[PDB]
Design a protein around this ligand. Structure first.
Ligand SMILES: NC(=O)OP(=O)(O)OC[C@H]1O[C@@H](n2cnc3c(N)ncnc32)[C@H](O)[C@@H]1O
Ligand SMILES: [Mg+2]
Ligand SMILES: [Zn+2]
Ligand SMILES: [Zn+2]
Ligand SMILES: [Zn+2]
Length: 647
């Protein structure tokens, strides 16, 4: 029974700070209670000969500790000291150092405002002084990441709320999203236009040495290139990061598994589940038992896979976007080790109903019986699973809010009201389906969605100040592609509705640099408002929200932009609450489920919980609301159809 990778413990930290200890200032100190696990194992059993540490025979001082039953390092599989262990190496445009001098060159570079690649437990990070405006602009410029927020490493948790401090200091040592007023020391280019910052504490010996020296916050972001899987070997770091890093702090212990930092909110809500949680298994809900081995391929974005057997499920670490160049290698190594750890051999494969997905191509290469699950059915089921809804617990009404998933009959869904149990998904209503002009471009340029909404719902849209940039363009070639159905598929996407509103308000750049950027900006804007009396609504017309009425009231209700953003969330929540109410009540349903990437929105949650106080409300918490949780939903639906003896 192997455990997730564990933050360095107090006792090892104390040993590493104590002059005259053999392991004094040694960056690879670990013991039976802490250190790398999943990231250093080649095969089972967990035993030094089958880890990355086979290469380093123990000196005798270490071997006496590893073998002594009453010793903290008894069978510490990756134990070492300066005599027999891995050592640090510094590489900078010509220059070379090792061990302690390697550490000092990295610190001197960080102190002068340079960017250093640092080798971690499960990848490589890029670091620099988080208070240094020039360093941070340079890092963003070199990595072409003009907006996306950067995680920051702090030396200690002092001054953070209690609930943050308590999460930050667990073995898992996650990034924890914290209000940015707690951390005034960070320059303004850390999370521009957002309200929260991701902070973490040192969790490995090398990070402790660095932060003990620097006594200041450090950007500590992933060592990759957009479109590329993160490097896990020295030469792939050297190759990948040379345009970016001014120097490299690497070492000669191999990483064999990609393992990103995990990311939670202070409230405990999981956004990314990797380092420190993988590979822990999860109990399935009551009634699921004797389930055959099922491999669930998850989603094409923010991918995780899932192994289902017996009365448990095991989720992989975050593996990213599956359409990326060589991401299949890492996926496949995670799958090998996971199957070796649990002695797992799949009898069935489950994957998404979208036939253009990479994951559905991989699934047909496996010579197993395969089955398909609707994207939004799976969202809803991951959420019921996580709240321990019983196999036979009854129907719920689900609100599934996201970007785009394939729905029934080739339709693109993302704002749906559903009747849901673990076997069935009936679509009840939701947003109107509205063109995505330019297909994939619709997610990158919010103004296209504003245009598609205006064309369908706003008479004389050209006359509103909020449509000015749109109207000054020759939008009418795009309007004709839309009429004729040329790369302008219909989608009831709630994510594309956020984008239309954000473009109307002008709160995002015209072209976006990351998925969801316009929606986060809109939500960060709405959250500075404490609530307003306003006349904006989204009425119900048969079983869909009436956006003609919404845009007419919204475009004609002048108010500060935060109050306009707040009013949008409120009308949307209210409008969905009215739909879910009619559907639940007239069927005798008393429990409501919410899932999909948009449900990560705090204001929209708070608003829906406000309108739906007459119901039991079920929201994601220990698993991501979005695509990170989808493999689990696939799993419980396949298990449930199986348990019912479905052919
Ligand atoms: N190539 C690539 O994907 O970059 P990456 O994955 O290293 O991005 C950092 C991750 O930390 C999270 N994160 C960090 N700071 C955040 C903030 N202020 N608000 C929301 N999410 C944040 C967020 O989920 C984000 O994906
Ligand atoms: Mg503070
Ligand atoms: Zn320890
Ligand atoms: Zn030794
Ligand atoms: Zn989704």
């Amino acid at each position: 029974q192997i455990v997730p990778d564990a933050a360095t413990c107090p006792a090892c930290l104390a040993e590493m700070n104590t002059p005259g200890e053999r392991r004094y200032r040694y960056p690879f100190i670990n013991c039976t209670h802490c250190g790398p696990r999943f990231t250093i194992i080649r095969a089972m059993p967990y035993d030094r000969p089958f880890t990355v540490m086979a290469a380093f025979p123990l000196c005798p001082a270490c071997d006496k500790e590893y073998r002594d039953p009453l010793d903290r390092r008894f069978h510490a599989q990756p134990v070492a000291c300066p005599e027999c262990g891995p050592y640090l190496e510094w590489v900078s445009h010509g220059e070379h150092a090792e061990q302690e001098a390697a550490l000092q060159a990295a610190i001197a570079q960080l102190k002068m405002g340079n960017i250093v690649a640092i080798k971690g437990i499960g990848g490589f990070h890029l670091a620099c002084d988080a208070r240094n405006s020039n360093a941070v602009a340079t890092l963003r410029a070199r990595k072409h990441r003009p907006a996306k927020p950067l995680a920051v490493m702090l030396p200690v948790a002092d001054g953070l709320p209690d609930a943050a401090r308590q999460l930050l200091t667990t073995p898992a040592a996650p990034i924890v999203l914290v209000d940015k007023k707690y951390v005034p020391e960070l320059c303004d280019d850390i999370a521009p236009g957002l309200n929260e910052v991701g902070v973490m504490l040192p969790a490995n010996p090398l990070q402790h040495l660095l932060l003990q020296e620097l006594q200041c916050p450090l950007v500590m972001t992933s060592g990759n290139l957009s479109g590329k899987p993160p490097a896990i070997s020295n030469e792939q770091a050297l190759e990948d990061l040379q345009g970016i890093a001014d120097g490299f702090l690497i070492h000669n212990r191999d990483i064999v598994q990609r393992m990103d930092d995990s990311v939670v909110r202070e409230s405990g809500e999981m956004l990314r589940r990797s380092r420190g949680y993988v590979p822990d298994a999860l109990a399935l809900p009551p009634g699921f038992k004797n389930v055959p081995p099922v491999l669930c391929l998850g989603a094409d974005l923010k991918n995780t896979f899932c192994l289902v057997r017996g009365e448990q499920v095991v989720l992989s670490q975050h593996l990213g976007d599956l359409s990326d160049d060589g991401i299949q290698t890492q996926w496949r190594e995670a799958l090998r080790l996971m199957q070796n750890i649990y002695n797992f051999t799949p009898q069935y494969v489950v994957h998404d109903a979208h036939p253009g997905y990479v994951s559905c191509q991989w699934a047909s290469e496996m010579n197993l019986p395969t089955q398909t699950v609707l994207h939004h059915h799976a969202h809803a089921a991951a959420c019921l699973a996580e709240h321990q809804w019983p196999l036979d617990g009854g129907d719920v009404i689900a609100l599934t809010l996201d970007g785009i998933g394939m729905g029934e009959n080739g339709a693109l869904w993302g704002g749906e009201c559903l009747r849901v149990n673990y076997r069935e998904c009936e679509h009840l209503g939701g947003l109107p389906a509205v063109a995505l002009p330019g297909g994939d471009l619709a997610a990158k340029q919010p103004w296209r969605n504003l245009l598609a909404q205006c064309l369908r719902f706003v008479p004389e849209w050209q006359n509103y100040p909020e449509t000015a940039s749109v109207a000054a363009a020759n939008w009418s070639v795009l309007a004709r592609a839309i009429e004729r159905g040329i790369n302008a598929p219909l989608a009831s996407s709630c994510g594309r509705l956020f984008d239309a509103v954000a473009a109307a308000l002008g709160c995002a750049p015209a072209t976006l640099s990351y998925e969801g950027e316009a929606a986060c900006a809109l939500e960060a804007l709405a959250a500075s408002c404490d609530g307003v009396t306003h006349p904006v609504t989204m009425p119900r017309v048969d079983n869909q929200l009436d956006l003609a009425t919404f845009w007419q009231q919204w475009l004609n209700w002048q108010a500060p932009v935060n109050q306009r953003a707040w009013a949008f969330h409120d009308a949307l929540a209210q409008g969905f609450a009215a739909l879910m109410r009619e559907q639940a009540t007239m069927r005798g349903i008393t429990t409501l489920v919410f899932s999909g990437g948009v449900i990560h929105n705090r204001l929209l949650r708070a608003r829906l919980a406000h309108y739906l106080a007459d119901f039991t409300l079920l929201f994601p918490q220990s698993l991501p609301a979005g695509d990170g949780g989808l493999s689990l939903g696939q799993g419980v639906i396949a298990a449930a159809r199986w348990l019912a003896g479905e052919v």
